[PDB]
Copies of this chain bind each other. A is one copy, B any other.
């Protein structure tokens, strides 16, 4: 939890794993001043809220801190800024809020919110990137990133088999969206979905977009990249960075040659 962006990632991640479907994250002054994350995911029972900010004390708590993987992370954060946790769970309950050590009731929908008041705008650009990644990683969750009351981006969630182009356009701009060649490949466990910009029309600006996710986790393999490259260099002798946003899926296999051919094949096909 070094940079603010990193913190955004954390809190935002927590929210997602918490079952979030809408994450409205607002930032003020590179996040240094304010950093608020409000999710509609699971909540935190009043009790957990307390220690969530704060080992002899867990003796009594009787392993309730086990219901807080993020809680552990919160402690690391709160000990670096004015943390103001405030959530309310789903089951028969009222909303609560913690400060600092002071857990009192409050108003809040079945969700969670967090205020944070700890190379100025650079920081925001880092957060923007981060959220971009996540956004593409989870097309099923609305995300709204704002700065100093100024709405910056609104990545609406996409329902079942819906308009993927819209959100893709909002995350990567129409520039890419226009050159986007949608691809759907599948060979048993191997699945390759996503887009690849028409090489012939790929500007170095577009080549900035190179996102590849392997089973949800954004990876970065030189092998996967070479495959996509070679595919384009083969369509046309044009050897240069390609623009893409692909999603690879395979059966648990931490890294295989075939995989390369599967991708090379998938992509190459879409081009022709």
**Bound-state Cα–Cα, A98 to B249, Å:** 50
Return 27 A-B CB contacts under 8 Å, by A number: A22-B150, A24-B151, A26-B109, A34-B109, A36-B107, A36-B109, A38-B107, A40-B149, A86-B106, A97-B105, A97-B106, A97-B107, A104-B105, A104-B106, A104-B107, A105-B105, A105-B106, A105-B107, A106-B106, A106-B107, A107-B108, A107-B113, A107-B115, A142-B149, A144-B151, A151-B154, A151-B156
Interface 1/0 per residue, A9-24 and B, CB below 8 Å: 0000000000000101
Chain B positions within 8 Å of A142 at CB level: 149
Sorted nearest first, the 10 A-B pairs with minimum C-beta distance are A97-B107, A106-B107, A105-B106, A107-B113, A86-B107, A106-B106, A104-B107, A22-B149, A104-B106, A40-B149
Please report the C-alpha to C-alpha distance between residue A151 and residue B166 in the assembled complex, in whole angstroms.
12
Q: Which of A145-193 contact B (CB under 8 A)?
A: 149-151, 154, 156
| Chain B residue, CB-CB nearest to A115 | B107
Alpha-carbon gap, A149 to B86, bound state (A): 17
A230 CB within 8 Å of chain B:
no
Pick the most buried of A22, A105, A142: most chain B CB atoms within 10 A of its CB.
Answer: A105
Q: Mark A85-110, 1 if CB is under 8 A from B, else 0.
A: 01000000000010000001111110
Report A151 CB to chain B, min CB distance, Å.
6
A81 contact set on B, CB distance < 8 A? none
| A101 vs chain B, min Cβ distance (A) | 12
A22, B147: Cα distance in complex, Å: 13
Check A84 for interface membership: any CB of B closer than 8 A. yes
- The smallest C-beta distance from A49 to any residue of chain B, in angstroms, reads 12
Q: A36-B109, A86-B106, A144-B151 are in contact. List 19 more A-B contacts (CB 8 A).
A: A22-B149, A22-B150, A26-B109, A36-B107, A84-B107, A86-B107, A97-B105, A97-B107, A104-B106, A104-B107, A105-B105, A105-B107, A106-B106, A106-B108, A107-B108, A109-B149, A142-B149, A149-B156, A151-B154
